[PDB]
Design a protein around this ligand. Structure first.
Ligand SMILES: OC[C@H]1O[C@H](O[C@H]2[C@H](O)[C@@H](O)[C@H](O)O[C@@H]2CO)[C@H](O)[C@@H](O)[C@@H]1O
Lengths: 165, 426
């Protein structure tokens, strides 16, 4: 029931970083994301875009269990996103759909402008690994901490690769 | 547990010269006083991540380069750091086989390919083509012997026939393997398996034939030919048989394209003996004395080490391995290799047995190896959606504007493909 947190800062207005994050994947800064399928999009009473997206992934930590497990491959990610342009806030929760029962990994991202005003964006991140059969080990967890921290860091670079286009 | 410090533990396949490798280890311990243990666990290529991910496993893992990318992806392998003058002693295309993401993840040991191996007393003139082997078998079976026997359990052996008329693993271009494009269910892959399957279906081979059965028979003069690799020579040498190693045959006029392997030594990310394993591999293994010690046990193939390869490339057996190796491709090191090998393993065995027809088997293998986004069929409708939405999302939404979605029509059409897409899966 562990964590990995972060708070990155992007050097562009909130608008463009959100325009980016909404057309993020697939893209060359993260080739482990095979593609993103938007299953449902709704605007709510408050004017916030709700999307349900299902991602197709590769070498993320539910594949690290295929090591200890024995044999498998493709891992699917449920994602719910809400963007409120009035409140200037983008939220995003994700879970693994397949290769669960073993481990479940819950990420959560929030893009928002810097509280001091510099036309720059700050993203606040966390990942919640829970597992039944809680073996792990600090080594395996460090592996998981490391691979989480890379999709994280590749996700940002994926933004910059988009907003510089 | 955590690996043992002050000790080197080594995994290498049991069909390789491990008693020789053990003798390099002894030379190391005799010299450095650091004990070395050489084991050969079964299903080695699967068990290493199973324990090197928990911090366990061997200090040094010995396998073909094709598995080592999957390992580096999951950070199971330390990055190896030889100096410039040490990598000048190894052929640089072998290093190429162990560069993942521009990082070196293993020491290359030796280039391996499959060659044809035949009994000369039984058969003085080996078939130049697969399509003539049924006859060879019908004429030899009349003398109680048989034509061919090579190990159907591992797809490594039956692949150069599948690759012959145009099967491949993934498509290579632009410095990248396209993991989304897999040439295992094309015409020139169905045709090769259908031949093998027909060999079986016609009692010319046998679907149960594994490494041991095929090795036993060829060596005991029971079958005229085998397919196998350099490691296998030292048992025919110690057999009556007067063998020849030669170029593989051809299928539909095309040569057999073996998946070339580069036996590689990987250091474990979890090893507290990393500097001890560098010393072992660089200064005791990749020496002519080191490599000869191994190569005299079971032969290594064309070693990666230039100085020793000079004496080696004189062997007519090495020449024939290299003939076949140059008629095939180097295996890629990408993490999808295992899904590839598993799919082919399943397809061939299931076709060979009858549980699946050929087209069934390689259809299944198309999808199990492809790694496709669920809605790959509909990318063209998402592309024209996405353009509409990103335009709406930017201009009539992010800057406040009201009017409901102008992209509802394209969405629902794409929503239809992606909903049949999910249903045809899970
Ligand atoms: O059959 C699938 C395996 O193919 C190769 O394994 C070869 C290996 O390279 C060779 O040295 C060894 O002795 O024989 C096996 C076939 O049994 C790949 O390197 C493996 O990744 C595959 O599992």
């Amino acid at each position: 029931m562990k964590i990995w947190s972060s708070e990155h800062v992007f050097g562009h207005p909130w608008d463009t970083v959100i325009q980016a994050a909404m057309r993020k994947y697939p893209n060359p800064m993260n080739p482990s994301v095979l593609g993103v399928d938007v299953l449902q999009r709704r605007v709510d009473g408050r004017g916030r875009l709700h999307s349900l997206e299902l991602l197709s992934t590769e070498w993320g930590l539910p594949s690290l269990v295929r090591a200890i497990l024995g044999t498998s491959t493709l891992t699917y990610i449920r994602e719910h996103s809400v963007v409120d342009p009035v409140e200037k806030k983008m939220e995003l929760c994700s879970t693994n759909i397949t290769l669960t029962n073993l481990v479940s990994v819950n990420e959560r991202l929030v893009y928002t402008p810097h509280p001091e005003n510099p036309e720059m964006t700050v993203l606040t991140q966390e990942a919640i690994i829970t597992v039944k059969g809680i073996s792990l080990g600090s080594y395996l967890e460090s592996l998981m901490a490391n691979t989480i921290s890379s999709n994280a860091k590749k996700g940002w670079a994926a933004i910059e690769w988009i907003i510089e286009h | 547990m955590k690996i043992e410090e002050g000790k080197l533990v080594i995994w290498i396949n049991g069909d390789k010269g491990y008693n020789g490798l053990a003798e390099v280890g002894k030379k190391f311990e005799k010299d450095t006083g650091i004990k070395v243990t050489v084991e050969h666990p079964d299903k080695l290529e699967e068990k290493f991540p199973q324990v090197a991910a928990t911090g366990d496993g061997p200090d040094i893992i010995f396998w073909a380069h094709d598995r080592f990318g999957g390992y580096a992806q999951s950070g199971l392998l330390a990055e190896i750091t030889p100096a410039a003058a040490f990598q000048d002693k190894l052929y640089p295309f072998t290093w190429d086989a162990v560069r993942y993401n521009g990082k070196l993840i293993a020491y290359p040991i030796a280039v391996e390919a499959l060659s044809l191996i035949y009994n000369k007393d039984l058969l003085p003139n080996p078939p130049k083509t697969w399509e003539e082997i049924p006859a060879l078998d019908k004429e030899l079976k009349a003398k109680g012997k048989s034509a061919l026997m090579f190990n159907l359990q591992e797809p490594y052996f039956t692949w150069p026939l599948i690759a012959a008329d145009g099967g491949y693993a993934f498509k290579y271009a632009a410095g990248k393997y396209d993991i989304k494009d897999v040439g295992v269910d094309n015409a020139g892959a169905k045709a090769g398996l259908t031949f093998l399957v027909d060999l079986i279906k016609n009692k010319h081979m046998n679907a149960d034939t594994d490494y041991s059965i095929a090795e036993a028979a060829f060596n005991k003069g029971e079958t005229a030919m085998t397919i196998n690799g350099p490691w296998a020579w030292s048992n025919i040498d110690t057999s009556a048989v007067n063998y020849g190693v030669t170029v593989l045959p051809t299928f539909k006029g095309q040569p057999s394209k073996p998946f070339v392997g580069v036996l590689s030594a990987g250091i474990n990310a979890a090893s507290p003996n990393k500097e001890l394993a560098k010393e072992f591999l660089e200064n005791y293994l990749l020496t002519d004395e080191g490599l000869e010690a191994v190569n005299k046990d079971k032969p290594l193939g064309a070693v990666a080490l230039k100085s020793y390869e000079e004496e080696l490339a004189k062997d007519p057996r090495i020449a024939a391995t290299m003939e076949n190796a140059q008629k095939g491709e180097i295996m890629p090191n990408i993490p999808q290799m295992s899904a590839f090998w598993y799919a082919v393993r399943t397809a061939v065995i299931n076709a060979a047995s009858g549980r699946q027809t050929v087209d069934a088997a390689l259809a299944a293998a198309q999808t199990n190896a492809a790694a496709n986004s669920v809605g790959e069929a509909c990318t063209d409708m998402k592309r024209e959606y996405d353009q509409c939405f990103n335009r709406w999302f930017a201009e009539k939404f992010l800057k406040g504007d009201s009017s409901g979605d102008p992209c509802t029509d394209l969405f629902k059409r794409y929503q239809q493909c992606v909903q049949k897409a999910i249903k045809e899966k899970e």
